[PDB]
Symmetry: D2
Subunit: 116 residues, 4 copies
């Protein structure tokens, strides 16, 4: 169980070795002053998939993450983050997470973990 | 800001090209390991980043980096301090330090496209 | 013609709209103190493909780039970087550049440009 | 100075615990196809100061590096990479490297190594 993911209404859809798919919906409480999905909401979603995918290999903590924003989203938008393992080392691992909504690539997340 | 209120974040300081936001790690901000969720610390840093950049005019985030140095438990008071590192016509870059009790918890680097 | 690419012995293997492949070989002058390819060389290779691919869309300048290192390479290693377009906006574009050697992902590069 | 630094004509101006400064000049063979300093040359400069600074703490390997470009440079420009330690832990370290030329912040480099 992940308290923050549930607080944000994010749901784990699928889990597997080095991979995970998390889904959610942009709600009124996830917006910024401009009426669009807060950058922190989209990151949390992708970061959640990243955390889940990396821990399927054992305990791991976030080291460095990059988030590239491409499309703004309004409330009501359905979103999915799919994390895929691009590198797995004895001490670190890196994952690419695509944030997608209605077939559109909303953002691209890249993250590396430190394997405890 | 709906999301900021949702996370219980508060704006402490706002000036030209800078912003300071504070919050506290609550039970609902923890991850599967019982520590502050990376998404919560980023959201905090991202908030200061958005506020600081917007003192220069409307802008949209392009690329952001977050480096985590220390984990935090529930109850920890945390703060995000944003400073402008570069300002141009169409872009701006900010450094945001996430600190808790004098310790650097994480480092955020973000660039925006100025509208 | 790209002077730095030439200085480093990098060759353009392919160039098409929003895409590029650049290849080279790790030489003695590309090594760090440990005897492996300097992070700057690998980055320069990835960056070159990134620059070429992004400019097929029109003059563009780099804004932010990320480089994640997975495997070290020694002199004599053949390496190639494939740049692919992940997002194309009117004012910006983002590319993924896989750096490989013998079918293995040596490094991953992500870069965004400002479209003039 | 490792082989790549020598090839690029880079000089070490300062080296102390957790910090380093590397200087170089943009030569004709350091230019991109646009006639300005190649993004890979500026990064190699930053990456060199980064590598020197991190290894003052002992052997370390680069994991993730970010490079943000702010201003273009022409041939003849004197440039410096000034690296400072922002975090130091048992198994990792992160450094901020400012790339400056003639009093201007040309680029910002952020990088994290894994300490061996
Ligand atoms: C987000 C979803 C869950 C997935 C997991 C996450 O991403 S959770 C949120 C995002 N990520 C994080 O919080 C990771 C933070 N980073 C770290 O903990 C570390 O940098 C690291 C494990 C990657 C590397 O640490 P090292 O192996 O080098 O070991 P080191 O002992 O030097 O630890 C570094 C610093 O963290 C502290 N620290 C480590 N474990 C701690 C703990 N359980 N409780 C309190 N503090 C702790 C140390 O005291 C030190 O702070 P001092 O020097 O001040 O004494
Ligand atoms: C390496 C591959 C080559 C392909 C392109 C690259 O990636 S080259 C290497 C990597 N990238 C860079 O160096 C990117 C540098 N960044 C920039 O030029 C800029 O920040 C930018 C275009 C992204 C955004 O600038 P803005 O749109 O905000 O406008 P702004 O007016 O503030 O920028 C003014 C500065 O840029 C200059 N400038 C303007 N047009 C220029 C041009 N066509 N060629 C060179 N330089 C130019 C001005 O002279 C001044 O430099 P002075 O104050 O010196 O007079
Ligand atoms: Cl990054």
């Amino acid at each position: 169980r992940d308290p923050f993911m549930e607080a944000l209404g994010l749901k784990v859809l699928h889990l597997a070795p080095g991979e995970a798919v998390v889904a959610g919906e942009v709600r009124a409480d996830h917006l910024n002053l401009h009426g669009t999905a807060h950058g922190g909401f989209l990151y949390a979603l992708a970061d959640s998939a990243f955390a889940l995918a990396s821990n399927t290999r054992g305990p791991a903590v976030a080291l460095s993450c990059r988030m590239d924003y491409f499309r703004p989203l309004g409330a009501g938008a359905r979103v999915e983050a799919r994390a895929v393992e691009v590198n797995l080392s004895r001490r670190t691992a890196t994952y690419r997470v695509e944030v997608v909504s209605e077939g559109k690539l909303v953002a691209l997340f890249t993250g590396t973990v430190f394997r405890l």
